[PDB]
mmCIF file of all heavy atoms in Angstrom:
data_model
loop_
_atom_site.group_PDB
_atom_site.id
_atom_site.type_symbol
_atom_site.label_atom_id
_atom_site.label_comp_id
_atom_site.label_asym_id
_atom_site.label_seq_id
_atom_site.Cartn_x
_atom_site.Cartn_y
_atom_site.Cartn_z
ATOM 1 N N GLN A 1 0.812 -1.209 0.000
ATOM 2 C CA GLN A 1 0.000 0.000 0.000
ATOM 3 C C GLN A 1 0.848 1.264 0.000
ATOM 4 O O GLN A 1 0.302 2.366 0.111
ATOM 5 C CB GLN A 1 -0.961 0.033 1.193
ATOM 6 C CG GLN A 1 -0.324 0.320 2.536
ATOM 7 C CD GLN A 1 -1.352 0.470 3.638
ATOM 8 O OE1 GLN A 1 -2.551 0.335 3.404
ATOM 9 N NE2 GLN A 1 -0.887 0.786 4.838
ATOM 10 N N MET A 2 2.165 1.132 -0.138
ATOM 11 C CA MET A 2 3.053 2.287 -0.159
ATOM 12 C C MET A 2 3.558 2.627 -1.557
ATOM 13 O O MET A 2 3.683 3.809 -1.891
ATOM 14 C CB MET A 2 4.236 2.042 0.787
ATOM 15 C CG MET A 2 5.187 3.201 0.994
ATOM 16 S SD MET A 2 6.594 3.256 -0.128
ATOM 17 C CE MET A 2 7.290 4.831 0.343
ATOM 18 N N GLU A 3 3.827 1.620 -2.394
ATOM 19 C CA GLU A 3 4.541 1.814 -3.651
ATOM 20 C C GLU A 3 3.620 2.018 -4.846
ATOM 21 O O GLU A 3 3.950 1.566 -5.950
ATOM 22 C CB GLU A 3 5.480 0.640 -3.918
ATOM 23 C CG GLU A 3 6.632 0.537 -2.944
ATOM 24 C CD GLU A 3 7.555 -0.620 -3.262
ATOM 25 O OE1 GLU A 3 7.230 -1.405 -4.174
ATOM 26 O OE2 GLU A 3 8.605 -0.741 -2.600
ATOM 27 N N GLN A 4 2.466 2.664 -4.663
ATOM 28 C CA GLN A 4 1.677 3.081 -5.820
ATOM 29 C C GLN A 4 2.396 4.164 -6.617
ATOM 30 O O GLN A 4 2.257 4.239 -7.843
ATOM 31 C CB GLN A 4 0.296 3.580 -5.388
ATOM 32 C CG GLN A 4 -0.669 2.504 -4.919
ATOM 33 C CD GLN A 4 -0.488 2.149 -3.464
ATOM 34 O OE1 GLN A 4 0.166 2.871 -2.713
ATOM 35 N NE2 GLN A 4 -1.089 1.042 -3.049
ATOM 36 N N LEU A 5 3.170 5.007 -5.942
ATOM 37 C CA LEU A 5 3.895 6.102 -6.571
ATOM 38 C C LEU A 5 5.399 5.898 -6.392
ATOM 39 O O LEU A 5 5.855 4.900 -5.826
ATOM 40 C CB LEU A 5 3.456 7.458 -6.005
ATOM 41 C CG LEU A 5 2.174 8.126 -6.527
ATOM 42 C CD1 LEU A 5 0.901 7.473 -5.994
ATOM 43 C CD2 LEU A 5 2.183 9.617 -6.213
ATOM 44 N N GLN A 6 6.170 6.869 -6.881
ATOM 45 C CA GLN A 6 7.630 6.775 -6.915
ATOM 46 C C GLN A 6 8.202 7.496 -5.701
ATOM 47 O O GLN A 6 8.472 8.698 -5.729
ATOM 48 C CB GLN A 6 8.171 7.348 -8.219
ATOM 49 C CG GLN A 6 9.672 7.181 -8.406
ATOM 50 C CD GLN A 6 10.152 7.707 -9.745
ATOM 51 O OE1 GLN A 6 9.369 8.237 -10.532
ATOM 52 N NE2 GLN A 6 11.444 7.559 -10.009
ATOM 53 N N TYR A 7 8.376 6.753 -4.611
ATOM 54 C CA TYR A 7 9.057 7.248 -3.423
ATOM 55 C C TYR A 7 10.275 6.416 -3.058
ATOM 56 O O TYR A 7 11.355 6.973 -2.836
ATOM 57 C CB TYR A 7 8.079 7.296 -2.243
ATOM 58 C CG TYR A 7 7.004 8.358 -2.349
ATOM 59 C CD1 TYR A 7 5.771 8.069 -2.925
ATOM 60 C CD2 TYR A 7 7.226 9.648 -1.882
ATOM 61 C CE1 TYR A 7 4.786 9.034 -3.024
ATOM 62 C CE2 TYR A 7 6.245 10.618 -1.972
ATOM 63 C CZ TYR A 7 5.028 10.307 -2.548
ATOM 64 O OH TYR A 7 4.048 11.267 -2.646
ATOM 65 N N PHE A 8 10.139 5.093 -2.981
ATOM 66 C CA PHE A 8 11.271 4.212 -2.715
ATOM 67 C C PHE A 8 11.581 3.422 -3.981
ATOM 68 O O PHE A 8 10.910 3.555 -5.007
ATOM 69 C CB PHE A 8 11.007 3.242 -1.551
ATOM 70 C CG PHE A 8 10.820 3.895 -0.193
ATOM 71 C CD1 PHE A 8 10.432 3.123 0.887
ATOM 72 C CD2 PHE A 8 11.056 5.250 0.022
ATOM 73 C CE1 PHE A 8 10.248 3.680 2.139
ATOM 74 C CE2 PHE A 8 10.852 5.820 1.268
ATOM 75 C CZ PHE A 8 10.465 5.027 2.330
ATOM 76 N N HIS A 9 12.603 2.576 -3.897
ATOM 77 C CA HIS A 9 12.931 1.697 -5.020
ATOM 78 C C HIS A 9 13.545 0.411 -4.478
ATOM 79 O O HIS A 9 14.700 0.411 -4.050
ATOM 80 C CB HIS A 9 13.872 2.381 -5.999
ATOM 81 C CG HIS A 9 14.297 1.496 -7.125
ATOM 82 N ND1 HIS A 9 13.443 1.126 -8.142
ATOM 83 C CD2 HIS A 9 15.482 0.901 -7.393
ATOM 84 C CE1 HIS A 9 14.086 0.342 -8.988
ATOM 85 N NE2 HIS A 9 15.326 0.191 -8.558
ATOM 86 N N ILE A 10 12.774 -0.671 -4.500
ATOM 87 C CA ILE A 10 13.308 -1.984 -4.156
ATOM 88 C C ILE A 10 14.047 -2.536 -5.368
ATOM 89 O O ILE A 10 13.452 -2.733 -6.433
ATOM 90 C CB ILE A 10 12.202 -2.940 -3.691
ATOM 91 C CG1 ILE A 10 11.644 -2.497 -2.341
ATOM 92 C CG2 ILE A 10 12.725 -4.357 -3.610
ATOM 93 C CD1 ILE A 10 10.496 -3.341 -1.860
ATOM 94 N N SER A 11 15.346 -2.771 -5.212
ATOM 95 C CA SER A 11 16.176 -3.223 -6.319
ATOM 96 C C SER A 11 15.894 -4.691 -6.613
ATOM 97 O O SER A 11 15.544 -5.465 -5.717
ATOM 98 C CB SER A 11 17.654 -3.006 -5.998
ATOM 99 O OG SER A 11 18.496 -3.404 -7.064
ATOM 100 N N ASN A 12 16.036 -5.067 -7.880
ATOM 101 C CA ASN A 12 15.512 -6.339 -8.371
ATOM 102 C C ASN A 12 16.605 -7.406 -8.476
ATOM 103 O O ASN A 12 17.092 -7.742 -9.557
ATOM 104 C CB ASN A 12 14.785 -6.120 -9.699
ATOM 105 C CG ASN A 12 15.610 -5.326 -10.706
ATOM 106 O OD1 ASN A 12 16.767 -4.988 -10.455
ATOM 107 N ND2 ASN A 12 15.012 -5.029 -11.853
ATOM 108 N N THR A 13 16.983 -7.921 -7.295
ATOM 109 C CA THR A 13 17.499 -9.282 -7.052
ATOM 110 C C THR A 13 18.714 -9.625 -7.924
ATOM 111 O O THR A 13 18.681 -10.529 -8.759
ATOM 112 C CB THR A 13 16.399 -10.334 -7.251
ATOM 113 O OG1 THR A 13 16.052 -10.423 -8.638
ATOM 114 C CG2 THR A 13 15.157 -9.963 -6.466
ATOM 115 N N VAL A 14 19.794 -8.883 -7.706
ATOM 116 C CA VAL A 14 20.994 -8.972 -8.534
ATOM 117 C C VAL A 14 22.061 -9.744 -7.774
ATOM 118 O O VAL A 14 22.385 -9.390 -6.636
ATOM 119 C CB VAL A 14 21.505 -7.573 -8.921
ATOM 120 C CG1 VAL A 14 22.824 -7.667 -9.672
ATOM 121 C CG2 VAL A 14 20.459 -6.849 -9.750
ATOM 122 N N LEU A 15 22.602 -10.791 -8.410
ATOM 123 C CA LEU A 15 23.728 -11.537 -7.854
ATOM 124 C C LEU A 15 24.926 -10.624 -7.629
ATOM 125 O O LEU A 15 25.195 -9.716 -8.420
ATOM 126 C CB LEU A 15 24.119 -12.702 -8.769
ATOM 127 C CG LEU A 15 23.494 -14.085 -8.522
ATOM 128 C CD1 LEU A 15 23.885 -14.612 -7.142
ATOM 129 C CD2 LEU A 15 21.979 -14.115 -8.713
ATOM 130 N N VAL A 16 25.628 -10.868 -6.530
ATOM 131 C CA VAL A 16 26.499 -9.862 -5.911
ATOM 132 C C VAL A 16 27.745 -9.648 -6.767
ATOM 133 O O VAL A 16 28.299 -10.619 -7.317
ATOM 134 C CB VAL A 16 26.852 -10.284 -4.475
ATOM 135 C CG1 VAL A 16 27.487 -11.665 -4.429
ATOM 136 C CG2 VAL A 16 27.758 -9.273 -3.799
ATOM 137 N N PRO A 17 28.149 -8.401 -7.003
ATOM 138 C CA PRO A 17 29.521 -8.134 -7.455
ATOM 139 C C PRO A 17 30.480 -8.280 -6.282
ATOM 140 O O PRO A 17 30.276 -7.687 -5.221
ATOM 141 C CB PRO A 17 29.455 -6.692 -7.970
ATOM 142 C CG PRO A 17 28.288 -6.092 -7.275
ATOM 143 C CD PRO A 17 27.298 -7.203 -7.083
ATOM 144 N N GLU A 18 31.536 -9.072 -6.480
ATOM 145 C CA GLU A 18 32.439 -9.437 -5.397
ATOM 146 C C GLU A 18 33.523 -8.403 -5.132
ATOM 147 O O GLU A 18 34.554 -8.751 -4.545
ATOM 148 C CB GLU A 18 33.078 -10.797 -5.677
ATOM 149 C CG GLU A 18 32.122 -11.970 -5.537
ATOM 150 C CD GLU A 18 31.699 -12.210 -4.099
ATOM 151 O OE1 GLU A 18 32.503 -11.954 -3.181
ATOM 152 O OE2 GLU A 18 30.559 -12.660 -3.884
ATOM 153 N N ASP A 19 33.326 -7.152 -5.541
ATOM 154 C CA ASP A 19 34.233 -6.059 -5.210
ATOM 155 C C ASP A 19 33.506 -5.124 -4.247
ATOM 156 O O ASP A 19 32.924 -4.115 -4.643
ATOM 157 C CB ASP A 19 34.688 -5.338 -6.467
ATOM 158 C CG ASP A 19 35.604 -6.186 -7.320
ATOM 159 O OD1 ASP A 19 36.323 -7.033 -6.752
ATOM 160 O OD2 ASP A 19 35.601 -6.010 -8.556
ATOM 161 N N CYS A 20 33.567 -5.466 -2.965
ATOM 162 C CA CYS A 20 33.016 -4.655 -1.883
ATOM 163 C C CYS A 20 33.924 -4.850 -0.675
ATOM 164 O O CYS A 20 35.053 -5.340 -0.791
ATOM 165 C CB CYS A 20 31.554 -5.025 -1.579
ATOM 166 S SG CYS A 20 30.333 -4.558 -2.823
ATOM 167 N N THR A 21 33.434 -4.471 0.501
ATOM 168 C CA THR A 21 34.183 -4.593 1.741
ATOM 169 C C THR A 21 33.278 -5.209 2.797
ATOM 170 O O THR A 21 32.092 -4.880 2.878
ATOM 171 C CB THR A 21 34.713 -3.218 2.187
ATOM 172 O OG1 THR A 21 35.507 -2.661 1.133
ATOM 173 C CG2 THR A 21 35.584 -3.322 3.437
ATOM 174 N N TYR A 22 33.839 -6.117 3.593
ATOM 175 C CA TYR A 22 33.088 -6.873 4.594
ATOM 176 C C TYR A 22 33.150 -6.114 5.914
ATOM 177 O O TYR A 22 34.143 -6.179 6.641
ATOM 178 C CB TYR A 22 33.647 -8.286 4.705
ATOM 179 C CG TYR A 22 33.432 -9.078 3.436
ATOM 180 C CD1 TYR A 22 34.401 -9.108 2.435
ATOM 181 C CD2 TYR A 22 32.239 -9.755 3.216
ATOM 182 C CE1 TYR A 22 34.196 -9.809 1.267
ATOM 183 C CE2 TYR A 22 32.025 -10.462 2.056
ATOM 184 C CZ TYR A 22 33.004 -10.487 1.086
ATOM 185 O OH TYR A 22 32.776 -11.198 -0.070
ATOM 186 N N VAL A 23 32.079 -5.387 6.218
ATOM 187 C CA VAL A 23 32.016 -4.531 7.389
ATOM 188 C C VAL A 23 30.987 -5.099 8.363
ATOM 189 O O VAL A 23 30.281 -6.062 8.069
ATOM 190 C CB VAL A 23 31.693 -3.071 7.017
ATOM 191 C CG1 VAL A 23 32.786 -2.502 6.130
ATOM 192 C CG2 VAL A 23 30.345 -2.986 6.327
ATOM 193 N N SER A 24 30.909 -4.489 9.543
ATOM 194 C CA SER A 24 30.099 -5.008 10.633
ATOM 195 C C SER A 24 29.056 -3.985 11.061
ATOM 196 O O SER A 24 29.183 -2.788 10.796
ATOM 197 C CB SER A 24 30.981 -5.399 11.831
ATOM 198 O OG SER A 24 30.222 -5.995 12.871
ATOM 199 N N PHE A 25 28.011 -4.479 11.724
ATOM 200 C CA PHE A 25 26.976 -3.640 12.326
ATOM 201 C C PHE A 25 26.573 -4.260 13.656
ATOM 202 O O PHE A 25 25.909 -5.301 13.684
ATOM 203 C CB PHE A 25 25.768 -3.487 11.402
ATOM 204 C CG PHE A 25 26.047 -2.664 10.181
ATOM 205 C CD1 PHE A 25 26.277 -3.268 8.961
ATOM 206 C CD2 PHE A 25 26.088 -1.284 10.258
ATOM 207 C CE1 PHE A 25 26.545 -2.506 7.843
ATOM 208 C CE2 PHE A 25 26.355 -0.523 9.138
ATOM 209 C CZ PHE A 25 26.583 -1.137 7.937
ATOM 210 N N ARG A 26 26.962 -3.617 14.754
ATOM 211 C CA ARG A 26 26.714 -4.111 16.100
ATOM 212 C C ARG A 26 26.004 -3.044 16.924
ATOM 213 O O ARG A 26 26.308 -1.852 16.806
ATOM 214 C CB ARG A 26 28.037 -4.508 16.760
ATOM 215 C CG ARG A 26 27.929 -5.125 18.140
ATOM 216 C CD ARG A 26 29.298 -5.550 18.655
ATOM 217 N NE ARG A 26 29.900 -6.566 17.795
ATOM 218 C CZ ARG A 26 31.003 -6.382 17.077
ATOM 219 N NH1 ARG A 26 31.639 -5.224 17.119
ATOM 220 N NH2 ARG A 26 31.471 -7.360 16.317
ATOM 221 N N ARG A 27 25.039 -3.470 17.739
ATOM 222 C CA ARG A 27 24.450 -2.611 18.759
ATOM 223 C C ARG A 27 25.266 -2.764 20.035
ATOM 224 O O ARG A 27 25.363 -3.865 20.587
ATOM 225 C CB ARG A 27 22.984 -2.957 18.996
ATOM 226 C CG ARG A 27 22.291 -2.076 20.005
ATOM 227 C CD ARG A 27 20.801 -2.358 20.036
ATOM 228 N NE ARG A 27 20.424 -3.636 20.624
ATOM 229 C CZ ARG A 27 20.135 -3.807 21.911
ATOM 230 N NH1 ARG A 27 20.168 -2.773 22.740
ATOM 231 N NH2 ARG A 27 19.793 -5.003 22.367
ATOM 232 N N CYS A 28 25.847 -1.658 20.502
ATOM 233 C CA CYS A 28 26.997 -1.737 21.390
ATOM 234 C C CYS A 28 26.675 -1.568 22.865
ATOM 235 O O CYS A 28 27.515 -1.931 23.694
ATOM 236 C CB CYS A 28 28.043 -0.703 20.975
ATOM 237 S SG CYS A 28 28.739 -1.069 19.365
ATOM 238 N N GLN A 29 25.505 -1.016 23.206
ATOM 239 C CA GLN A 29 24.970 -0.944 24.570
ATOM 240 C C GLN A 29 25.897 -0.220 25.549
ATOM 241 O O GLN A 29 25.857 -0.484 26.755
ATOM 242 C CB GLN A 29 24.630 -2.340 25.108
ATOM 243 C CG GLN A 29 23.507 -3.046 24.369
ATOM 244 C CD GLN A 29 23.249 -4.453 24.895
ATOM 245 O OE1 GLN A 29 23.963 -4.941 25.768
ATOM 246 N NE2 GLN A 29 22.225 -5.106 24.364
ATOM 247 N N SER A 30 26.758 0.669 25.048
ATOM 248 C CA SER A 30 27.552 1.556 25.883
ATOM 249 C C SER A 30 27.293 3.018 25.583
ATOM 250 O O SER A 30 27.670 3.871 26.393
ATOM 251 C CB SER A 30 29.055 1.272 25.726
ATOM 252 O OG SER A 30 29.387 -0.001 26.237
ATOM 253 N N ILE A 31 26.684 3.331 24.438
ATOM 254 C CA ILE A 31 26.052 4.634 24.276
ATOM 255 C C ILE A 31 24.838 4.720 25.189
ATOM 256 O O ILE A 31 24.556 5.775 25.771
ATOM 257 C CB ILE A 31 25.670 4.862 22.800
ATOM 258 C CG1 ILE A 31 26.879 4.704 21.881
ATOM 259 C CG2 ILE A 31 25.091 6.257 22.593
ATOM 260 C CD1 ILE A 31 27.935 5.759 22.081
ATOM 261 N N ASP A 32 24.129 3.602 25.366
ATOM 262 C CA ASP A 32 22.887 3.601 26.127
ATOM 263 C C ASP A 32 23.125 3.628 27.629
ATOM 264 O O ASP A 32 22.251 4.079 28.377
ATOM 265 C CB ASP A 32 22.048 2.374 25.764
ATOM 266 C CG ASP A 32 21.512 2.422 24.341
ATOM 267 O OD1 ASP A 32 21.282 3.530 23.818
ATOM 268 O OD2 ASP A 32 21.317 1.344 23.742
ATOM 269 N N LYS A 33 24.283 3.153 28.090
ATOM 270 C CA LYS A 33 24.558 3.024 29.518
ATOM 271 C C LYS A 33 25.606 4.024 29.991
ATOM 272 O O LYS A 33 26.286 3.779 30.994
ATOM 273 C CB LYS A 33 24.995 1.601 29.861
ATOM 274 C CG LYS A 33 23.868 0.642 30.233
ATOM 275 C CD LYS A 33 22.973 0.288 29.054
ATOM 276 C CE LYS A 33 21.791 -0.547 29.491
ATOM 277 N NZ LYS A 33 22.206 -1.809 30.161
ATOM 278 N N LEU A 34 25.756 5.138 29.275
ATOM 279 C CA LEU A 34 26.585 6.253 29.708
ATOM 280 C C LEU A 34 25.776 7.277 30.484
ATOM 281 O O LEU A 34 26.342 8.038 31.274
ATOM 282 C CB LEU A 34 27.231 6.923 28.490
ATOM 283 C CG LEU A 34 28.475 7.817 28.578
ATOM 284 C CD1 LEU A 34 29.181 7.752 27.244
ATOM 285 C CD2 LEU A 34 28.221 9.275 28.940
#
């Protein structure tokens, strides 16, 4: 019910190009306990 118009764009399922970087995303719970 959101994508009747042009606001976002879900990209269509492309096999990965292997030239990127392997990075991390962690919730660290020390910003919250300061």
